[PDB]
Write a protein that binds this ligand. Structure first.
Ligand code: CLA
Ligand code: CLA
Ligand code: CLA
Ligand code: CLA
Ligand code: CLA
Ligand code: CLA
Ligand code: CLA
Ligand SMILES: CCCCCCCCCCCCCCCC(=O)OC[C@H](COP(=O)(O)OC[C@@H](O)CO)OC(=O)CCCCCCCCCCCCCCC
Ligand SMILES: CC1=C(/C=C/C(C)=C/C=C/C(C)=C/C=C/C=C(C)/C=C/C=C(C)/C=C/C2=C(C)CCCC2(C)C)C(C)(C)CCC1
Ligand SMILES: CC1=C(/C=C/C(C)=C/C=C/C(C)=C\C=C\C=C(C)\C=C\C=C(C)\C=C\C2=C(C)CCCC2(C)C)C(C)(C)CCC1
Ligand SMILES: CC1=C(C/C=C(\C)CCC[C@H](C)CCC[C@H](C)CCCC(C)C)C(=O)c2ccccc2C1=O
Ligand code: SF4
Ligand code: SF4
Lengths: 138, 69, 74, 80, 141, 43, 740
């Protein structure tokens, strides 16, 4: 919380935030750039990465992750942090939660929604009639 | 099975069900699907418009029947 | 294509002779098949053991008087 | 939210996690394959349902399965 | 004579439109020979050579001789193709062969289609014609 | 030798299909340059 | 310009898929085959170097020039050896132009109907005869040697392609030498061509045509070498020059130009004996065009420090709204081949549309105005070609944005700032499209409903609630109080369509004043609506090709992808390719309505026959002002009524147009299988057919696959466009040949 970082030199665009950012939720990507460079914003147009901490508020998590994947990672920037910010001001760290990126296996991470069978061993809908049971339950 | 053994697939969800493929490896460790089978008919796997698929898949020993030696 | 080029005689025209035979088998003497119910002497027309057709005069007039749509000419 | 289920035919190639646009999946330790890792979905509330993970999955049939369910603002991908 | 049909000879409409024969080809006559050939057919109310597909060995030239001709040619084609597909599956360069036809093998499998039906009978006798149902892929159910 | 890499190119499917089609079209058209209007076998 | 860069060999001819990496592993599935033709001409995918890409483009342009020249040579050969040019030249109105004498194989000779003069052949509508007479050709041997010239010219372009790819291919700085190229193309390609044609107008076209416009019956005039050799023939035609090999050109070198005023004229109007343009005006035209193009090809600094760098012109131009203005567009246009193709395709499409709307109302060839088949055919053809090229310019704009947009070049320039308010642009275009759709088509269906109600006083007609095109009528007024006013040194008006009197050549009408009423207001607002929706779709594809609020990484996905999955509600057809796919149907709609308006307006208010007393009996008798305001009238008096010719066409010279009418209906309806369906069904059905083939040991090595989602869409749009365009083509040709 209390997100630190200079705004990148961006002239603004009509593709940025809407009412949903102010009453439902918004997202912020904070990273640190070694130099003043150029990157394409997900809300279109060029922007100037300031040297040091840069902070960008986007409307969706996927926009922040697209910014991180197509702009920051090919520019060797892999210290970014994506947060969800609620209208009351509450900030929740979202993308590099346990400090390791999700595509590296990290001890201490537990498995969610892992089914101990194959797709073929899933039951039949006819046997799996009126109940809360679905064909993919563990 | 053993490497190079032609085997038939008994996995219904598999693209190569009731078809033969050569065994390329059997994993000595205790995993659920140790057998690597390499086929010649490629898969459906890939994006739309991509000219290709996979010819290599993994199966258990109870989902593979050795026809040859 | 053959009608376009001023040659309608080159049209492949196939008579529905199986359905025309069925129409005759219902009694239409137009096609000249001389078969069941379009021959007055077939055992289907006379119903030899019981002689109890009785529908047949009315139906035969219906099938062999074109003023209706009962088994139209094909 | 959409339902992302990971099936034990997973070879832990991490290709589904690398292709997720909304950070739903992650690699967790698992002794069920040679790679030592299985995909997981702790964040299916962020799932949009694009099925890029199933496109990236090399197992036949797929170890990752996306079942589109109830639609929320996040799963519809609305920036508004 | 069948189904109220008459020969084109005693058909007034036929002779009326034969009196106005168009010329399909570069023959000076053309339409005259077309119509004198079509005269043997069974015409009708429109005076057009209707066809009967009935076996009817007198009027067998309207279906049956062309039927045999087509079946022999198309079965030749199919057997030639099957023989080629079977004979390129042996080589591991089969996928290359389906876009780049191995022309000597193509002619070799082409020229043996003259005995296309008889051989298939032997295949129907042998079992080298239809694949077993446990050697071919199938979806679940 | 390029006499073998012309032969392979003039053995591909688009060229041989076009060749076989042109050939059978030639048979069929020169059939109708000859004895015309054959809707039945004359019998 | 490097020596032997690519070895000329037959080896890669034997290797299909050499030019890519995914295409060279052999064909495992059938999609490979499609991908081959899908990747043949995408040179920027083949390699990753601008030099090789530019060399490939140069050698492909040489090949395309070869195919156009072999086309030209073919048409000149068919006009020399298989036409009735001379007979048509003897009696213009009495002979319909024709070529392509078909082979009498099976019925076919019925299409060789008589056109006049004993010639039995297909009546052509390309307008070739008229341009040959205008150019000054008299006999056919000139056309045979022009065909020979076209063949050797095609051979020259082909060998030039081989030479500039395999033997001496240019380096990048040559292709990127943009100033010298523009100077050589304005002055040298365009100016020299214009001057040389005026060098053919002055010496060949004017004398021959001045003789032909009198009743000389062609052949009695000399071959065109005599009019350079012997200025005695140059005497009686325009005698106010000395006419010598040194003397005649001295009036040019001394500003003595009113001497030349007998052939460099600015008369305007149409020649009342031929219905074409005044060829002296076209000559003086080509002269001035040549001069202005050779002037404009002296503007760009190449090597002598004289002229402009286009970069300085661009980077100079910037204002307070547009930030840095056009900074970086030089690099954008000199590094991206797709960004140049966008502009060049859009401009050639627009200029082809201009060509269509100019050669109808100033017909510039003798005996083309009173060739109604020719007039309709060339208008409609150039409109369709232009619409296609405009959509292609939009397509390559989207390709540039997906592939060749660098944000580092484009910081606060015009490109960057339109990317930053694409939402405002698209929403305002959306609103304009909805407004135009309502206030044009709702007017139409209001008119249908009032006319069905029996309330014609409540319609938008000239007899109901009038919508007069007052501004277009005023512009029309200004073009006729101007052959004596604001164009003083000009005899007649620019075109008769703006006003005047019925120019009637033969018994038919060449061109008359085209008044604009409520029906014309209505169709013009429909055309504006259809253009605006096509612009909306294509601009949305261009401006949102890289990212959107929905998918912020579309540029990573590329230009040509089906979707990003069923999630986010469903993301089918987000790609710029798919916007081009939708804009193709909307271009179809736009151009179809434009050519329908053209056909009905000419057939009702312009085309027709003149009586000896001088009364115009129009082809459809002026139904346009009262029928074209309702959709029922368009269906009845244009689509039902004028299709009688194409459907009664069997058994005559015009049967092939009826056959293609039906065949194009078939192809259009065949399109909807590909358009409405998806490839999951087709893959599933191919699977059971594969089972059948597997049973008889006949399933092929190359696995049968359904066509891809993009391929299915492209097949659907190709069949849809071909079917609809060919239906309209067959309809137009049969109707206006039987009636016009
Ligand atoms: C060797 C070639 C070959 C052979 C023996 C067969 C045989 C068969 N096909 Mg098949 N087919 C082929 C090629 C072939 N096909 C090709 C190229 C296509 C893609 C157009 C198809 C598409 C197809 C469909 C959709 C179906 C079949 C079906 C069938 C079965 C029923 C007969 C039939 O429907 O005829 C119809 C066949 C066609 C209309 C295909 C056109 C014929 C092609 C051009 C012949 C191919 C020859 C090849 C190019 C050259 C080989 C010569 C070689 C020496 C180089 C039958 C066993 C049906 C089935 O499922 O079983 C009951 C069926 O539904 N085929
Ligand atoms: C698939 C349906 C079909 C069938 C059964 C026919 C059948 C026929 N057509 Mg037709 N046609 C069709 C579709 C069809 N056509 C289509 C789709 C078109 C539009 C392109 C045409 C356009 C057309 C024309 C213009 C003509 C025909 C003609 C013919 C007849 C003579 C053909 C011939 O000479 O063979 C002989 C060749 C062989 C027997 C080859 C075997 C010999 C080798 C050496 C073995 C024949 C009965 C001709 C005719 O005279 O009509 C009666 C003719 O004038 N057709
Ligand atoms: C001496 C003759 C000759 C030879 C041996 C080669 C050989 C080669 N060329 Mg080259 N080329 C030639 C002449 C030749 N070329 C000429 C005259 C031109 C100018 C047009 C070119 C321009 C050219 C370019 C730009 C390139 C090549 C390439 C290549 C190499 C790849 C082969 C290939 O796949 O393309 C073979 C193509 C065909 C067999 C079909 C070509 C289609 C023709 C040109 C147009 C057809 C249009 C016509 C109207 C038909 C329309 C059909 C419709 C009506 C149904 C290969 C070694 C490529 C390369 O370097 O590989 C990486 C490449 O970049 N060539
Ligand atoms: C302004 C350019 C221009 C215009 C209006 C014309 C007009 C004409 N030419 Mg052409 N011509 C030109 C340039 C032009 N020419 C050049 C550069 C060449 C050398 C390649 C030729 C070579 C040529 C030949 C061989 C022939 C003609 C002929 C003709 C007449 C036939 C009809 C026609 O072309 O449609 C009208 C064309 C247009 C409306 C499009 C012109 C626009 C050009 C392509 C670009 C100019 C853009 C310019 C900067 C601004 C103009 C924009 C405009 C939309 C306002 C006609 C009056 C025929 C003739 O001799 O008549 C009897 C004929 O046989 N011309
Ligand atoms: C490419 C353009 C072109 C070419 C090749 C020619 C070529 C020629 N012109 Mg010409 N001319 C042109 C454009 C051209 N002209 C234009 C645009 C005008 C209008 C200003 C003229 C007006 C003109 C006159 C008045 C005369 C020539 C004449 C000549 C011939 C004399 C040779 C010479 O003076 O040197 C020569 C073959 C002379 C001639 O013999 O006429 C046939 C002559 O009297 N020209
Ligand atoms: C100057 C003209 C021009 C040039 C040089 C290009 C060049 C290119 N275009 Mg393109 N385009 C153009 C005009 C042009 N386009 C126009 C006018 C349109 C609107 C229709 C398009 C819309 C377009 C799309 C949507 C795409 C391209 C793409 C491409 C790239 C690869 C295309 C390819 O592989 O060839 C392949 C060509 C074929 C396989 C031919 C397909 C069949 C054609 C379309 C129908 C022809 C039918 C014919 C008219 C009549 C029917 C005859 C039949 C009965 C036998 C390439 C750089 C592709 C790309 O990805 O760019 C990077 C892409 O997807 N273009
Ligand atoms: C005839 C069939 C049809 C109709 C009516 C439309 C209509 C429309 N299209 Mg569409 N389109 C079509 C075929 C059609 N399309 C096909 C086949 C394709 C496949 C390629 C497309 C692809 C397409 C694209 C890609 C786009 C459109 C767009 C549009 C909208 C244009 C804006 C407008 O005019 O506002 C006004 C609406 C009309 C003129 C339609 C008639 C309405 C009447 C006149 C009023 C009805 C009165 C009242 C409402 C009745 C109430 C009754 C009550 C009981 C409820 C419009 C609603 C564009 C858009 O979104 O525009 C901004 C857009 O981008 N279309
Ligand atoms: C339009 C007249 C015009 O150009 O206005 C002025 C303004 C640009 O003017 P500038 O002085 O910035 O122009 C300088 C450079 O763009 C030209 O070199 O246009 C816009 O900002 C877009 C207008 C919205 C278009 C709405 C439709
Ligand atoms: C149509 C066609 C064709 C034809 C072509 C031709 C035949 C052409 C041509 C051509 C030519 C044949 C051209 C020319 C030209 C020219 C010019 C354009 C000129 C110039 C000039 C100059 C440079 C001048 C200078 C001067 C001055 C100004 C100063 C001093 C004096 C003098 C006068 C010297 C072909 C066959 C391909 C094919 C089809 C199409
Ligand atoms: C009498 C007659 C008729 C009738 C006919 C019929 C009714 C029939 C049938 C039939 C049937 C009921 C059948 C069947 C079958 C079965 C199966 C099972 C089959 C088969 C097939 C196959 C097996 C084939 C094979 C092959 C060959 C041989 C060659 C090529 C390749 C292939 C593979 C394709 C009509 C009236 C029309 C006409 C007249 C005559
Ligand atoms: C019909 C249809 C198909 C099936 C269409 C196919 C499979 C096209 C291929 C058909 C032709 C017949 C392939 C020709 C095969 C050989 C090349 C034939 C040999 C040619 C010689 C005879 C010369 C799709 O795959 C599809 C995909 C997505 C959306 C809609 C559709 C769709 O509507
Ligand atoms: S892509 Fe498939 S196999 Fe690879 S880690 Fe993900 S679920 Fe497992
Ligand atoms: S329907 Fe087809 S195009 Fe649309 S999201 Fe699904 S797979 Fe993609």
């Amino acid at each position: 919380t209390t997100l630190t970082g200079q705004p990148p030199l961006y002239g603004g665009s009509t593709g940025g935030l809407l009412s949903k950012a102010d009453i439902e939720e918004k997202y912020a990507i904070t990273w640190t750039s070694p130099k003043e460079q150029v990157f394409e914003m997900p809300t279109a147009g060029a922007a100037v990465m300031r040297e040091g901490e840069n902070l960008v508020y986007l409307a969706r998590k996927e926009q922040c992750l697209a910014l991180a994947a197509q702009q920051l990672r090919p520019r060797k920037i892999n210290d970014y942090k994506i947060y969800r910010i609620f209208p009351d001001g509450e900030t929740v760290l979202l993308h590099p939660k346990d400090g390791v990126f999700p595509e590296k296996v990290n001890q201490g991470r537990e498995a969610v929604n892992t089914v101990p069978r194959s797709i073929g061993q899933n039951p039949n809908p006819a046997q799996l009639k009126f109940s809360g049971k679905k064909p993919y339950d563990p | 099975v053993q490497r190079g053994s032609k085997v038939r697939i008994l996995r219904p969800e598999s693209y190569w069900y009731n078809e033969i493929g050569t065994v390329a490896s059997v994993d000595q460790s205790g995993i659920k699907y140790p057998v690597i089978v390499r086929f010649d008919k490629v898969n459906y796997t890939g994006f739309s418009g991509s000219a290709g698929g996979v010819n290599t898949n993994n199966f258990a020993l109870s989902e593979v029947e050795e026809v040859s030696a | 294509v053959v009608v376009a080029f001023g040659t309608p005689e080159k049209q492949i025209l196939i008579e529905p002779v199986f359905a025309q035979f069925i129409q005759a088998a219902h009694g239409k003497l137009l096609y000249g098949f001389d078969t069941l119910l379009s021959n007055p002497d077939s055992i289907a027309a006379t119903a030899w053991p019981n002689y109890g057709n009785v529908w047949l005069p009315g139906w035969l007039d219906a099938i062999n008087s074109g003023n209706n749509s009962l088994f139209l000419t094909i | 939210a959409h339902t992302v289920k990971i099936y034990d035919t997973c070879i832990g190639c991490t290709q589904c996690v690398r292709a997720c646009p909304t950070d739903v999946l992650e690699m967790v330790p698992w002794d069920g394959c040679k790679a030592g890792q299985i995909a997981s979905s702790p964040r299916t509330e962020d799932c949009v349902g694009c099925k890029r993970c199933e496109t990236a999955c090399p197992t036949d049939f797929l170890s990752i399965r996306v079942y589109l369910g109830a639609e929320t603002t996040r799963s519809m991908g609305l920036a508004y | 004579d069948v189904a109220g049909l008459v020969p084109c000879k005693d058909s007034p409409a036929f002779q009326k439109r034969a009196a106005a024969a168009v010329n399909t080809t570069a023959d000076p006559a053309s339409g005259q020979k077309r119509f004198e050939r079509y005269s043997q057919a069974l015409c009708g109310e429109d005076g057009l050579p209707h066809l009967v597909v009935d076996g009817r060995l007198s009027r067998a030239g309207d279906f049956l001789i062309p039927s045999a001709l087509f079946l022999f040619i198309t079965g030749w084609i199919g057997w030639v193709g099957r023989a080629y597909l079977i004979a390129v599956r042996n080589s591991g360069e089969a996928n290359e062969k389906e876009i780049i036809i191995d022309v000597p093998l193509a002619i070799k499998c082409m020229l043996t289609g003259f005995a296309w039906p008889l051989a298939a009978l032997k295949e129907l006798a042998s079992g080298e014609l239809t694949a077993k149902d446990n050697e071919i892929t199938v979806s679940p159910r | 030798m390029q006499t073998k890499h012309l032969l392979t190119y003039l053995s591909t499917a688009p060229v041989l299909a076009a060749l076989w089609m042109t050939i059978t079209a030639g048979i069929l058209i020169e059939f109708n340059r000859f004895y015309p209007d054959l809707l039945f076998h004359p019998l | 310009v490097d020596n032997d860069p690519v070895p000329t060999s037959f080896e890669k001819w034997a290797k299909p898929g050499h030019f890519d990496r995914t295409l060279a592993r052999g064909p495992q599935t059938t999609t490979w085959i499609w991908n081959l033709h899908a990747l043949a001409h995408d040179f920027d995918t083949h390699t990753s170097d601008l030099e090789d890409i530019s060399r490939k483009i140069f050698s492909a342009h040489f090949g395309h020039l070869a195919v156009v020249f072999i086309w030209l040579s073919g048409m000149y050969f068919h006009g020399a050896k298989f036409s009735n040019y001379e007979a048509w030249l003897a009696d213009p109105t009495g002979i319909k132009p024709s070529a392509q004498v078909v082979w009498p194989i099976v019925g076919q000779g019925i299409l060789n109907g008589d056109v006049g003069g004993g010639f039995h052949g297909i009546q052509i509508t390309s307008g070739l005869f008229q341009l040959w007479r205008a150019s000054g050709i008299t006999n056919e041997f000139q056309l045979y040697c022009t065909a020979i010239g076209g063949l050797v010219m095609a051979g020259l372009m082909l060998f030039a392609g081989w030479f500039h790819y395999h033997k001496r291919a240019p380096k990048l700085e040559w292709f990127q030498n943009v100033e010298s190229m523009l100077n050589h193309h304005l002055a040298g390609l365009l100016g020299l061509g214009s001057l040389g044609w005026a060098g053919h107008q002055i010496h060949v076209s004017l004398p021959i045509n001045q003789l032909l416009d009198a009743g000389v019956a062609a052949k009695d005039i000399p071959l065109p070498h005599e009019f350079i050799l012997n200025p005695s023939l140059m005497a009686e035609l325009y005698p106010n020059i000395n006419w010598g090999v040194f003397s005649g050109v001295i009036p040019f070198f001394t500003f003595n130009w009113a001497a030349y005023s007998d052939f460099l004229t600015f008369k305007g109007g149409l020649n009342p004996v031929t219905g074409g343009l005044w060829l002296s005006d076209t000559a003086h035209h080509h002269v001035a065009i040549a001069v202005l193009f050779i002037i404009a090809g002296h503007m760009y600094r190449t090597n002598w420090g004289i002229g402009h760098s286009l970069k300085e012109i661009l980077e100079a131009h910037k204002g307070p709204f547009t930030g840095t203005g056009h900074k970086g567009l030089y690099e954008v246009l000199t590094t991206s081949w797709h960004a140049q193709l966008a502009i060049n395709l859009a401009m050639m499409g627009s200029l082809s549309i201009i060509v269509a709307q100019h050669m109808y109302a100033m017909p510039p060839y003798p005996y083309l105005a009173t060739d109604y088949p020719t007039q309709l055919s060339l208008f409609t053809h150039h409109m369709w070609i232009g619409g296609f090229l405009i959509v292609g310019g939009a397509a390559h704009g989207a390709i540039f944005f997906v592939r060749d947009y660098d944000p580092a070049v484009n910081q606060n320039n015009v490109l960057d700032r339109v990317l930053r308010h694409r939402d405002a642009i698209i929403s305002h275009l959306n609103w304009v499209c909805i407004f135009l759709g309502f206030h044009s088509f709702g007017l139409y269906v209001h008119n249908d409903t009032m006319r069905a109600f029996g309330r014609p006083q409540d319609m938008f007609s000239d007899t109901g609630i009038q919508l007069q095109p007052v501004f277009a009528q005023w512009v029309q007024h200004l073009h006729t109080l101007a052959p004596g006013g604001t164009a003083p040194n000009a005899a007649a008006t620019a075109s008769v369509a703006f006003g005047g009197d019925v120019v009637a050549v033969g018994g038919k009408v060449a061109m008359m004043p085209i008044a604009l009423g409520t029906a014309d207001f209505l169709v013009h607002h429909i055309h504006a609506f259809t253009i605006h929706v096509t612009v909306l779709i294509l601009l949305k594809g261009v401006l949102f090709a890289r990212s959107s609020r929905l998918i912020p990484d579309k540029a990573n996905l590329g230009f040509r992808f089906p979707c990003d999955g069923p999630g986010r509600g469903g993301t089918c057809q987000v790609s710029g390719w798919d916007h081009v796919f939708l804009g193709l149907f909307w271009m179809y709609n736009c151009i179809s309505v434009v050519i329908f308006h053209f056909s009905w307006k000419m057939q009702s208010d312009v085309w027709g026959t003149v009586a000896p007393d001088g009364t115009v009996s129009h082809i459809t008798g002026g139904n346009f002002a009262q029928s074209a305001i309702t959709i029922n009238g368009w269906l009845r008096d244009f689509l039902w009524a004028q299709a009688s010719q194409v459907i009664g066409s069997y058994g005559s010279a015009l049967s092939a147009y009826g056959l293609l009418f039906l065949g194009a209906h078939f192809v259009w309806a065949f399109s909807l299988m590909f358009l409405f369906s998806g490839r999951g069904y087709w893959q599933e059905l191919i699977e059971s057919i594969v089972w059948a083939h597997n049973k008889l040991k006949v399933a092929p090595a190359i696995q049968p696959r359904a066509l891809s989602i993009i391929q299915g869409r492209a097949v659907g749009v190709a069949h849809y466009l071909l079917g609809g365009i060919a239906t309209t083509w067959a309809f137009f040709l049969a109707r206006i040949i039987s009636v016009g």
